[PDB]
Design an enzyme around this catalytic site. Structure first.
Site, mmCIF file in Angstrom:
data_model
loop_
_atom_site.group_PDB
_atom_site.id
_atom_site.type_symbol
_atom_site.label_atom_id
_atom_site.label_comp_id
_atom_site.label_asym_id
_atom_site.label_seq_id
_atom_site.Cartn_x
_atom_site.Cartn_y
_atom_site.Cartn_z
ATOM 1 N N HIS A 147 22.539 63.428 37.295
ATOM 2 C CA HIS A 147 23.188 63.074 36.036
ATOM 3 C C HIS A 147 24.713 62.909 36.092
ATOM 4 O O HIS A 147 25.439 63.881 36.303
ATOM 5 C CB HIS A 147 22.815 64.149 35.013
ATOM 6 C CG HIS A 147 23.156 63.802 33.598
ATOM 7 N ND1 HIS A 147 23.713 64.714 32.726
ATOM 8 C CD2 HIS A 147 22.972 62.665 32.884
ATOM 9 C CE1 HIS A 147 23.862 64.153 31.538
ATOM 10 N NE2 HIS A 147 23.419 62.908 31.608
ATOM 11 N N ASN A 197 25.551 68.256 28.015
ATOM 12 C CA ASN A 197 25.063 67.861 26.693
ATOM 13 C C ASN A 197 24.438 68.998 25.886
ATOM 14 O O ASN A 197 24.605 69.060 24.668
ATOM 15 C CB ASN A 197 24.109 66.654 26.790
ATOM 16 C CG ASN A 197 24.822 65.403 27.267
ATOM 17 O OD1 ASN A 197 25.965 65.152 26.885
ATOM 18 N ND2 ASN A 197 24.154 64.603 28.090
HETATM 19 N N1 LIG Z 1 26.286 56.053 28.786
HETATM 20 C C1 LIG Z 1 26.197 57.471 28.670
HETATM 21 O O1 LIG Z 1 26.875 58.082 27.865
HETATM 22 C C2 LIG Z 1 25.196 58.072 29.654
HETATM 23 C C3 LIG Z 1 25.673 59.225 30.448
HETATM 24 C C4 LIG Z 1 24.701 59.736 31.343
HETATM 25 C C5 LIG Z 1 23.454 59.263 31.499
HETATM 26 N N2 LIG Z 1 23.055 58.135 30.688
HETATM 27 C C6 LIG Z 1 21.636 57.641 30.907
HETATM 28 O O2 LIG Z 1 21.740 56.468 31.819
HETATM 29 C C7 LIG Z 1 20.690 55.442 31.565
HETATM 30 C C8 LIG Z 1 21.360 54.116 31.306
HETATM 31 O O3 LIG Z 1 22.457 54.361 30.330
HETATM 32 P P1 LIG Z 1 23.518 53.155 30.206
HETATM 33 O O4 LIG Z 1 24.466 53.659 29.204
HETATM 34 O O5 LIG Z 1 24.102 52.807 31.546
HETATM 35 O O6 LIG Z 1 22.821 51.882 29.673
HETATM 36 P P2 LIG Z 1 23.044 50.369 29.474
HETATM 37 O O7 LIG Z 1 22.291 49.885 28.308
HETATM 38 O O8 LIG Z 1 24.563 50.150 29.578
HETATM 39 O O9 LIG Z 1 22.504 49.716 30.868
HETATM 40 C C9 LIG Z 1 21.100 49.838 31.289
HETATM 41 C C10 LIG Z 1 20.833 48.680 32.234
HETATM 42 O O10 LIG Z 1 19.398 48.869 32.628
HETATM 43 C C11 LIG Z 1 18.828 47.596 32.758
HETATM 44 N N3 LIG Z 1 17.412 47.764 32.571
HETATM 45 C C12 LIG Z 1 16.573 48.064 31.528
HETATM 46 N N4 LIG Z 1 15.282 48.117 31.807
HETATM 47 C C13 LIG Z 1 15.200 47.842 33.119
HETATM 48 C C14 LIG Z 1 14.024 47.741 34.054
HETATM 49 N N5 LIG Z 1 12.783 47.925 33.695
HETATM 50 N N6 LIG Z 1 14.417 47.435 35.321
HETATM 51 C C15 LIG Z 1 15.639 47.223 35.820
HETATM 52 N N7 LIG Z 1 16.783 47.303 34.981
HETATM 53 C C16 LIG Z 1 16.499 47.613 33.646
HETATM 54 C C17 LIG Z 1 19.437 46.681 31.659
HETATM 55 O O11 LIG Z 1 19.207 45.366 31.838
HETATM 56 C C18 LIG Z 1 20.830 47.243 31.593
HETATM 57 O O12 LIG Z 1 21.807 46.394 32.358
HETATM 58 C C19 LIG Z 1 19.887 56.101 30.395
HETATM 59 O O13 LIG Z 1 18.747 56.791 30.945
HETATM 60 C C20 LIG Z 1 20.818 57.096 29.691
HETATM 61 O O14 LIG Z 1 20.194 58.115 28.938
HETATM 62 C C21 LIG Z 1 23.933 57.546 29.768
#
Ligand SMILES: NC(=O)c1ccc[n+]([C@@H]2O[C@H](COP(=O)([O-])OP(=O)(O)OC[C@H]3O[C@@H](n4cnc5c(N)ncnc54)[C@H](O)[C@@H]3O)[C@@H](O)[C@H]2O)c1
Ligand SMILES: NC(=O)c1ccc[n+]([C@@H]2O[C@H](COP(=O)([O-])OP(=O)(O)OC[C@H]3O[C@@H](n4cnc5c(N)ncnc54)[C@H](O)[C@@H]3O)[C@@H](O)[C@H]2O)c1
EC number: 1.1.1.35
Lengths: 293, 291
Positions: A147, A197
């Site tokens: 994470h 978190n």
């Molecule tokens: N942004 C935060 O604050 C944060 C911090 C830590 C962890 N996260 C976790 O990280 C993950 C992504 O968050 P994010 O903010 O980067 O999201 P985001 O929406 O910016 O990006 C996600 C990316 O995943 C791709 N995607 C979706 N489904 C897919 C599939 N089946 N195969 C391949 N690519 C796919 C999309 O096309 C997109 O470019 C989540 O699980 C979230 O809970 C988010």
């Protein structure tokens, strides 16, 4: 020990792209994966912009040295639309795609078949059970949570999440990888919210509740926590920063699992802003209005 | 308006001395009250030391001026063991004595009969209902909470707690005074924990619970919040800083006043350390060991 050298990062969004950047800037060979060549192009373009921005600041005394730095990092980041095509020779998969259990499981169940025997699988999921995603495979001893925090190239912490099935070998390799990334790994059981978190979000909710209750203004509460607690951001400022939708989603989950728990009671103000699509700094407005850049 | 110039600070301890110092440093006439001359003597000594420690750095280029700055400030602080004899014409009474409601009430109830008409009364209490004290007097319109943070001369924040009975005139006077102290006042209602502790203490208890659940080590939790949340101190490091007994006391209060709330459930670990007198840094040991 098998040392992580090749990393397959799935998801070139806010988090994935950042993970790929740091892994590549620290000497790892990376393959960034996403649904379309366009999305990938756009994501890689964002990584370049970020590196050049960092370079024009680290090598301000030498543009050529800055360019070399960027080019070398950027060149070690390949892109593919199907992770299955490259995991048979990867050391670690770091997944950062949509926060949906079914999608993630479908992803890992399939990759499980292509990945080399020593390949470790890790999810960057903030609210889902690593254990649930791990059981979508038969590679549980080699599955865990890794994470990160936004912005990834900047935040130094990484939470290494161990399920009851993760092997010590898998655990140690991710700790090593974390240090190799230049980050500081901490350990936590596969419990909701992990560390950050779990201690941060419920606090932000309490802040919202103190405000909805009308006991004090948002502005004053922010001032109070920055000056009195020493926080970089007041809670409303941070809420708008991490994302009100992102926050509501996490709390809904906790509420769902234990609706009787007062700590996870929904927030009308929070729900309203989210309903009104006011997600925070993402949309130029959350609890506060921001200058639409 | 009511411009505070003469201030009575009752209680020359950690908070009291600091309030006295900043008030004096900013041009207010101050009278510091406590129970014994020895206590007062040591309180004023601590103040001089803190002022000098500063002057030595700020007036390095001209020590004479530095010593005068300190002299002026100390000479603007009087001491007394009899609060009643001092409040006859003071503009403001800021109280920072033992966190005992009975004692506080007796104190203010008695002083209400001595203080001039315009005199404003204020408590620095953290875990007490400003109302449960203002009613101990008939000066409720001139009674408010004025909660400072340790170290008072460093921490710029001040929570101005107004009750339903508190005058607006009284409010704006405390706000003006806060700014005069070079502080930054925020407003909150007479709700438990006001803003800061209301949002901080429960989080600190949650950190302890995560630990007691076996989910992570104190060290990682501390590291997690520092690097992941950008906090100056990790929760356990902070608990030891603010004092474990101090914290426990505030949590028990909220627990008795609402034993149903999960955020206030007692911590075996916290209670133990308090029992075996491990209060934090001020004891050389709390969750961690010092010196
Ligand atoms: N942004 C935060 O604050 C944060 C911090 C830590 C962890 N996260 C976790 O990280 C993950 C992504 O968050 P994010 O903010 O980067 O999201 P985001 O929406 O910016 O990006 C996600 C990316 O995943 C791709 N995607 C979706 N489904 C897919 C599939 N089946 N195969 C391949 N690519 C796919 C999309 O096309 C997109 O470019 C989540 O699980 C979230 O809970 C988010
Ligand atoms: N974390 C803190 O240290 C902190 C922060 C904010 C507010 N407070 C509040 O400030 C008050 C004092 O806290 P402290 O840390 O300065 O305590 P302390 O124990 O260091 O000092 C209190 C001083 O009050 C004096 N005192 C007690 N009863 C008295 C009476 N009847 N008359 C005159 N003097 C009396 C004592 O002799 C002592 O010197 C409390 O109400 C507390 O809740 C404490």
């Amino acid at each position: 020990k098998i040392i992580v050298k090749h990393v397959t990062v799935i998801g070139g969004g806010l988090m994935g792209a950042g993970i790929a950047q740091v892994a590549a800037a620290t000497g790892h060979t990376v393959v960034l994966v996403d649904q379309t060549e366009d999305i990938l192009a756009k994501s890689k373009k964002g990584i370049e912009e970020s590196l050049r921005k960092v370079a024009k600041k680290k090598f301000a005394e030498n543009p050529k040295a800055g360019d070399e730095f960027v080019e070398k990092t950027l060149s070690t980041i390949a892109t593919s639309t199907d992770a299955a095509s490259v995991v048979h020779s990867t050391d670690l998969v770091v997944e950062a795609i949509v926060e949906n259990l079914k999608v993630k499981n479908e992803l890992f169940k399939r990759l499980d078949k292509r990945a080399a025997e020593h390949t470790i699988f890790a999810s960057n999921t903030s609210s889902l059970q690593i254990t649930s995603i791990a059981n979508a495979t038969t590679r549980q001893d080699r599955f865990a949570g890794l994470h990160f925090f936004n912005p990834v190239p900047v935040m130094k912490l990484v939470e290494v999440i161990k399920t009851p099935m993760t092997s010590q070998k898998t655990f140690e390799s991710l700790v090593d990888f974390s240090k190799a990334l230049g980050k500081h790994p901490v350990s936590c059981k596969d419990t909701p919210g992990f560390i950050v978190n779990r201690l941060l979000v419920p606090y932000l909710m309490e802040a919202i509740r103190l405000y909805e209750r009308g006991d004090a203004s948002k502005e004053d509460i922010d001032t109070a926590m920055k000056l009195g607690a020493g926080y970089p951001m007041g809670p409303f400022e941070l809420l708008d920063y991490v994302g009100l939708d992102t926050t509501k989603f996490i709390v809904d989950g906790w509420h769902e699992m234990d609706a009787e728990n007062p700590l996870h009671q929904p927030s009308p103000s929070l729900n309203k802003l989210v309903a009104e699509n006011k997600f925070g700094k993402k949309t130029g407005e959350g609890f506060y209005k921001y200058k639409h850049h």
